[PDB]
Amino acid sequence: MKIAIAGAGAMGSRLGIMLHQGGNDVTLIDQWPAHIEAIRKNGLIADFNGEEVVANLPIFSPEEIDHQNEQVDLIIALTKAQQLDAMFKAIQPMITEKTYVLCLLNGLGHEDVLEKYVPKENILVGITMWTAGLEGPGRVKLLGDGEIELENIDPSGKKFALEVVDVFQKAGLNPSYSSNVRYSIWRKACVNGTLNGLCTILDCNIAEFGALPVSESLVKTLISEFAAVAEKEAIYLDQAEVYTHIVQTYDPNGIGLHYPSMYQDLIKNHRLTEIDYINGAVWRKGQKYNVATPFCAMLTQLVHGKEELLGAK
Amino acid sequence: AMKIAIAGAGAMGSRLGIMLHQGGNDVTLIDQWPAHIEAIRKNGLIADFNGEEVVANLPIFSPEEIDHQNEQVDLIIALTKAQQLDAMFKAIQPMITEKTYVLCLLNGLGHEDVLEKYVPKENILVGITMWTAGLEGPGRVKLLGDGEIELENIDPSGKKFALEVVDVFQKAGLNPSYSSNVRYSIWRKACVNGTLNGLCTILDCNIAEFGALPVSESLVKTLISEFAAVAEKEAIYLDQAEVYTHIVQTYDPNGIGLHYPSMYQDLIKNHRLTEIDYINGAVWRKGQKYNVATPFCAMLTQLVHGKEELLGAK
Numbered sequence: 001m002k003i004a005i006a007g008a009g010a011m012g013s014r015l016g017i018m019l020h021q022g023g024n025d026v027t028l029i030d031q032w033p034a035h036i037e038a039i040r041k042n043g044l045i046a047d048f049n050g051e052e053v054v055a056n057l058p059i060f061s062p063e064e065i066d067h068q069n070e071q072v073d074l075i076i077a078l079t080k081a082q083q084l085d086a087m088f089k090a091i092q093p094m095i096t097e098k099t100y101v102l103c104l105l106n107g108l109g110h111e112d113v114l115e116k117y118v119p120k121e122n123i124l125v126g127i128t129m130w131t132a133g134l135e136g137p138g139r140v141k142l143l144g145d146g147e148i149e150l151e152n153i154d155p156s157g158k159k160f161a162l163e164v165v166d167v168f169q170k171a172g173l174n175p176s177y178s179s180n181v182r183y184s185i186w187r188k189a190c191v192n193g194t195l196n197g198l199c200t201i202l203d204c205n206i207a208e209f210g211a212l213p214v215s216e217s218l219v220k221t222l223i224s225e226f227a228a229v230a231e232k233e234a235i236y237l238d239q240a241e242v243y244t245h246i247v248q249t250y251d252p253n254g255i256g257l258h259y260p261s262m263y264q265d266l267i268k269n270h271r272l273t274e275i276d277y278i279n280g281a282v283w284r285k286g287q288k289y290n291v292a293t294p295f296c297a298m299l300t301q302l303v304h305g306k307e308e309l310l311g312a313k
Numbered sequence: 314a315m316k317i318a319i320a321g322a323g324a325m326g327s328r329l330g331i332m333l334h335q336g337g338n339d340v341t342l343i344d345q346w347p348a349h350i351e352a353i354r355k356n357g358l359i360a361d362f363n364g365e366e367v368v369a370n371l372p373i374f375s376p377e378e379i380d381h382q383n384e385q386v387d388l389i390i391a392l393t394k395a396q397q398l399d400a401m402f403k404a405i406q407p408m409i410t411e412k413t414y415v416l417c418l419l420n421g422l423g424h425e426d427v428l429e430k431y432v433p434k435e436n437i438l439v440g441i442t443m444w445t446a447g448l449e450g451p452g453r454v455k456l457l458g459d460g461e462i463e464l465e466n467i468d469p470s471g472k473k474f475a476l477e478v479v480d481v482f483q484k485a486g487l488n489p490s491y492s493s494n495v496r497y498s499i500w501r502k503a504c505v506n507g508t509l510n511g512l513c514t515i516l517d518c519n520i521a522e523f524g525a526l527p528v529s530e531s532l533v534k535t536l537i538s539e540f541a542a543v544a545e546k547e548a549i550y551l552d553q554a555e556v557y558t559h560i561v562q563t564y565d566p567n568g569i570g571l572h573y574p575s576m577y578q579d580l581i582k583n584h585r586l587t588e589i590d591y592i593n594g595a596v597w598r599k600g601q602k603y604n605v606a607t608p609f610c611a612m613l614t615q616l617v618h619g620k621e622e623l624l625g626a627k
């Protein structure tokens with residue numbers, strides 16, 4: 001298999017090394033100049049389970065890709081959501097009608113960007129439980145075990161999804177085909193589409209939010225909107241268990257006393273949030289599917305208003 | 314001679330009471346303030362009325378005292394704040410018959426929905442009072458200046474009696490007029506107050522700061538649309554463009570742009586409970602009964618109530 005890894009961060013580097021070792025043609029694409037230079041000069045150097053592994057993998061920045069580059073069977077997308085479109089536009093010369101994409105991004109709706117570059121039937125989604133650390137440019141620390149669960153988003157993509165599993169198996173990645181990955185991503189986005197935005201706007205921690213008399217109605221209204229949109233994509237969220245899952249976070253002996261990650265980005269660090277890929281994505285989908293998602297719409301607008309007020313970058 | 318009960322005998326109710334008494338009407342005061350009841354029972358209601366002392370020996374009762382031995386009245390004038398209106402009208406029911414009308418003088422939206430539990434819906438009038446009144450002490454008010462009252466029947470059957478109330482108020486010197494814009498102006502005002510108030514409160518910012526946001530147009534217009542959708546069901550047709558234009562004009566730092574709206578001062582400055590239930594909460598309540606979606610009103614109401622709880626507002 002010819003594989004391009006779009007985003008050669010810690011996870012991308014792990015996957016690249018392992019797939020290389022498994023006998024595949026691997027090309028890295030990355031936006032960190034020092035990292036690129038280091039890999040070009042000394043190879044990708046991994047502290048891989050106490051053993052040094054050096055892999056001489058081709059690497060390019062997106063601006064360097066053109067017609068001359070080799071075409072690939074699979075692109076593994078690790079590029080963060082806000083650079084995804086730009087990354088895929090750059091690597092277009094490497095894509096044919098037969099090219100598949102495995103999207104390993106967090107959050108929702110990435111297939112709307114990806115379908116501009118690749119048929120929908122060619123899109124796979126995955127979750128990785130591997131860990132990885134970058135020690136510096138061209139150097140990664142790889143420890144522990146893990147696995148990758150993946151799923152075709154379109155029923156025509158099943159055969160190739162199984163072929164990616166086989167490739168990943170021979171590379172030691174511990175893959176499985178799972179009919180639950182899209183559901184788990186939807187379910188997680190639900191969690192991230194409640195506490196994140198609501199704590200950020202109201203300015204409070206998780207247990208403080210949970211204790212509000214309005215918390216039940218706000219959370220449940222938001223879950224229902226995620227569920228209404230997900231249903232159009234043949235994902236049927238268990239709304240009662242999603243609610244039970246969120247209610248458990250309120251426990252002060254658990255993470256109750258923590259502030260959610262969106263609070264940390266915006267309120268603590270004045271950085272732009274992930275809202276466009278959570279409630280913003282449900283809203284975008286609702287608009288295309290003629291499903292009303294007003295709480296997601298308003299929460300998205302309020303968070304964007306708050307970002308601008310705090311001069312978030 | 315109309316029999317008139319004043320529900321809420323504060324400074325304004327006291328003005329109306331005295332003046333309607335001077336016009337020869339049969340006035341009864343209803344009030345929740347014990348010291349006020351005691352002073353009025355001892356010495357009558359005392360007004361410093363344009364530099365002259367006027368005393369009016371009016372009957373006065375607390376709501377809990379009212380029973381079927383009390384007089385049944387032609388008109389109740391409602392001035393009790395919204396938070397106590399329901400309990401006030403439940404208590405004064407013994408004074409209401411099928412022929413009793415209410416003139417609601419409260420600020421804000423949707424009070425007819427409480428009143429109609431106690432007074433026939435056909436008999437509800439709404440008005441705006443431009444008079445001023447001050448409270449000097451229990452049973453003692455200070456009345457200066459001029460004013461007027463504009464009023465309107467809510468139900469088309471209430472028109473003749475509304476006109477009769479105007480006549481009564483005219484003779485009492487209250488400068489009344491019948492106005493077919495009263496309900497509209499109340500809706501338009503609530504619409505304005507249903508945007509910047511909750512939004513600046515939740516986001517923590519002033520009016521111009523809010524206005525400049527790239528989401529200000531979308532937030533404001535969606536909220537306006539919800540107000541208009543529900544008003545339409547009650548045969549009030551809001552000019553959504555005019556309302557938006559008014560809101561944009563508030564962004565001007567030469568005008569009120571640098572100010573914070575009243576709800577912000579209530580909650581964010583003073584840690585006091587907001588009026589949200591009688592603005593966005595009222596649109597939301599009506600929308601539910603009319604099968605009209607009002608989700609921005611609903612969410613904004615819940616967020617404001619959320620913030621009240623977080624700040625320990627009282």
Ligand SMILES: [Mg+2]
Pocket residue numbers: 308309525
């Ligand atoms: Mg700005």
